[PDB]
Amino acid sequence: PQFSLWKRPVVTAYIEGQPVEVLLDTGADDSIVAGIELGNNYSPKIVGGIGGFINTLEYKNVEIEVLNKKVRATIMTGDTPINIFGRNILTALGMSLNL
Amino acid sequence: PQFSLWKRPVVTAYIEGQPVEVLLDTGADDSIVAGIELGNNYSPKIVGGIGGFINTLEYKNVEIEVLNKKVRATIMTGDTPINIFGRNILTALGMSLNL
């Protein structure tokens, strides 16, 4: 598909079967998701953006289906105002920015 | 041109004759640059991020040259770790995210 950017590039994904609305984000190195519990095999992390820093919990090899594709990808959970799939996932979908 | 996203999508833009490196950012509504001075025709803005909010100064109709094109866009100035071109600049340019 094509996202033309007049509006935000927002889709629904399934993360281990749970439906989440996520923002496709070329400006995020990582993917961060608020309000889902991925269990106990995590490593605590710090990520920055505009406005400071967050403590996240890093989960490896999590199962996602989005845009009718299926990937296993690293997901961080933390207190974010918007769930973002960053370049770790965009690349695995084979997505590019074109002009 | 095509951006693969294996590395952050970072280009040199000129904003009123001045060279800067900017991340092309699909998850940013607006465009924020640190270390420009654009003057006194400004309106103060609040812009939400992942970490918190920043106060910025917004300027309308700024002349920008990037990727061998020239555009007039709204640019906000402030304390951002990295310089962002958001969707207001990507759609002016005609860029899309493709799958």
From Swiss-Prot, chains A, B:
Q: Which residues form the signal peptide?
A: none
Output the superkingdom of the source species. Answer: Viruses
Region annotated Dimerization of protease sits at 1-5, 49-55, 88-99
Where is the catalytic site?
D25
Domain Peptidase A2 span(s) in chain numbering: 20-89
Its job:
Aspartyl protease that mediates proteolytic cleavages of Gag and Gag-Pol polyproteins during or shortly after the release of the virion from the plasma membrane. Cleavages take place as an ordered, step-wise cascade to yield mature proteins. This process is called maturation. Displays maximal activity during the budding process just prior to particle release from the cell. Also cleaves Nef and Vif, probably concomitantly with viral structural proteins on maturation of virus particles. Hydrolyzes host EIF4GI and PABP1 in order to shut off the capped cellular mRNA translation.
Oligomeric state and interaction partners are given as: Homodimer, whose active site consists of two apposed aspartic acid residues.
Protein's name in the database: Protease
- Per the UniProt entry, what species is this protein from, by scientific name? Human immunodeficiency virus type 2 subtype A (isolate ROD) (HIV-2)
